[PDB]
Amino acid sequence: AKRPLAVVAPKTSHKHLFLMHMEKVTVTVSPLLFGYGHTLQKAALDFYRRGLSARSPFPSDKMFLYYSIDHITPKIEVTWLDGSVYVPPLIEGVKAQDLIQMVMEQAWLAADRMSAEGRVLNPIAIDDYKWEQLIAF
Amino acid sequence: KRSGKPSDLPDYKQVYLPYDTAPTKTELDRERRKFMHAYSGRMEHRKMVEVKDVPQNMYTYGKEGMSIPISIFKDQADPVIGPEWTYPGIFENKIVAQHW
Amino acid sequence: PKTVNIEPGSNRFLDPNVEAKAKDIFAVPEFPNKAVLHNWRFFIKAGKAATGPPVGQEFSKLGLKAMDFAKAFNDRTKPHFKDDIELIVRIQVYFDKSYIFRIEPPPTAWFLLRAIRKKRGETGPVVLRGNYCAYLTLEMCYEIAKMKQMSWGKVEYPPIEVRVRRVVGQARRMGIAIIGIDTVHSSPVKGMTEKQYLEESEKHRKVHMIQYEALKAKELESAPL
Amino acid sequence: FQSEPYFEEEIEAYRAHHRPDVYVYKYNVSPTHLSLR
Amino acid sequence: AAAAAAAAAAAAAAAAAAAAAAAAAAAAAAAAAAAAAAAAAAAAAA
């Protein structure tokens, strides 16, 4: 890292997703899972449906959806460009709108860690998503 | 619904008789006389009702060996029913299949 | 003569030809999981799939087109369909003006015209006329349900016995009555005792005690436990 | 503002979320903070 | 065989989740706090 890491983070409640500096966002679920964690699954799947609608000109198929027959509580794995992985905590009683704030915060620190590691910057800007969301006015 | 369902006036297609023994003009109309009413409304205020358009032969009206051309697809025609005993789950649908 | 089956009334479904097609053009196009705006159910004659008064209007409520649905429904339905056939089209439009239409079997309301040799209004409900059209019996009503399946992913599920009560309802909701109902005696069949057929078919009820608890018994065992 | 403003305490950018539950005897220790847990 | 194309198929009611900034949440909360009182003072008349 060339410079000291940032110490202040934007307060924007993130309700979008994007690959500002991510590289791969997988999720694991269980169809066998029926009763245990009805809402725990209800969040992971929902985060997919709210992740496929990410916000950047990438193909939104940077997101994957795996069907684990392991009967494990659904767990999300996000890995960033440089490689590090972030496993969001899926506690009892956490919904989609909560997770997007989790990762997109840990995705601002990951970006500012990468921007500190010399990685190039993909600056978000007005492209097809600040539009087609401006009509929702 | 207004449209979306097949509408046309063909007639039936009979392959044979529900019986083996065909009656005459009187027995076709002997049992026809019964077919001029119905039990529309089944409660303490139960009443009669009229009917019309009763056919000539209610034996082979549509009972058996009778076909109705109601198919949507081209490679098909009217389907028929010949036999009687293994009514598909139908006997339990004989008396209770009505607004008692 | 010759009865079509020595199991009488067993005939689980149509011949294995039209059904392969009945699963073919009635195949449900799977959702792209998007967020719908409005579900539509129009009434198109399968031959001339043309922009009707509401069909073109509602489609054009959105700056969309009317013919693209039509021709892609017209030419898709140029073969495999008889002449002068009308169809219920269930359309599912999404937020991004994305739409995926199904094609529904022609249901009962305007179906009786091909079944009881009559027309709309002459099948007036119990409040309108009081009489009704040509009679029905307890096999003429079973066959019509074989053409109506909300479940094409599961043809035999649910079996005919649960939904057959529906079609005989609207036709009776329109006043038309069955001989097996509304009546004093049932169908007279001169091939046997005209009277004892009641007690002759009470056991035909029983072969389906073993089957009713077997047709539905294979349902839940065709599913997860 | 709109009325009596109370700002809940905040941390650095990186030490903010998912703080380590590393204690000393009945005390939550960390290089930046200390708090009886 | 399907609907319109161009861009990418977003799905999920893209029309939503406008990502409120700082000043919006500081306002969307203080506005919601005023409704808790405006629902209480109304119960103080009734």
Added chain:
Amino acid sequence: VIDDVNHALVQHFLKLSTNDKYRQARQMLVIGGRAMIEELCRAGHRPRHLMVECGKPIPEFLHDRRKTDVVLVDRSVSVAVTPGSDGYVGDFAIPTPPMKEKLIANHQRLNRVLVLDNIEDPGVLGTLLRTASGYQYDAIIATNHCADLYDHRVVRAARGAHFQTSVPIYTLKDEDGDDVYGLLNHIVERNNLLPLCYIAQADAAGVDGETAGTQTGFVSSPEAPVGRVFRSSVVGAAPVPLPAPRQSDSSYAASLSRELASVSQAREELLS
């Protein structure tokens, strides 16, 4: 009964019928028509001040709070504020299309655009608006100085077209050098984001593809040309697109006797 052209409601309609600045500033537009009002009234629209001339034709199919002021007007003002032989005149609430759907949801294949670039003339301008919609054209557009798409003559020519029967029409801006060389770049290049172009219906024509298209379209050819101009200028050639096909007619036709020949079959129906 208003036998005075100085009445506020009279001077209202005039500055609503002919002036164009103080039109949108109140979001209103004058409609004339005995049956043309019910046509709009049928699809949920109520005139603010429906001024019937004082006379015989008084149909009351929406009376009793038809957005009242159902005023009876003299013959004299029936002549002044109302160029038009109707005894049935009113005014309605301006709708609007959004200037963003020209830029984002540009659908690929069945996208043929109209432009209509010139200082135009009402009646003609209104007529094309009816027929362009009359075939479900998308993105009907304005120019440097065409007549307002809500002018009283235009709405008389449009005859129920302007309001959203089926009309994704659009209107464009004013730019710096007393010109509109920046009207195109902002959108038109982006209206080549979806691919093809044409410049027909100009009194002068060049490349002249000339109504000679053979193949039924290779039907899945997701690009589609756009609209045209009125007069002779190379302003349509200074834009980046290298397409230059300026179409003409065949026989002894003249102005306005070229477009409705072209747009008739040069529209979406290349399927034939």
Added chain:
Amino acid sequence: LVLDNIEDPGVLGTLLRTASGYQYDAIIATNHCADLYDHRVVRAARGAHFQTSVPIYTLKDEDGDDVYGLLNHIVERNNLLPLCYIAQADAAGVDGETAGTQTGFVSSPEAPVGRVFRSSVVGAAPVPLPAPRQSDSSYAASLSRELASVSQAREELLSDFC
């Protein structure tokens, strides 16, 4: 060309030039439709109204359908097939007027009446025109202009055999 209704100006002047601008012989003006020599109807065609290739066949008649005997008075039969322009229960212009192979006849009414009553009673081929919606329709001068330009010379359709 024919214009069969109780028409109005100058929605014919812009139409009595498509006969000229696309080289028609003359025009059956079904009077009393409207003004025909008017200083506007002629002005609406910019002087090309009074062109050498268009003598104004102003026709006086009624709904007697003896006008089809006038259609038979017009260069006999074996020249003029049905001509009607109606609403969209009819096939097309690239269906009927794509299949000429022969000679027929042109006629363009106005909106409020269509044609006189006995005009559709003698006909094997009317002509429709596409529309935005069902009850929505187009002009009287926009009717012929699509069709006076399909029956102009028909040289592409020859090359359109396939």
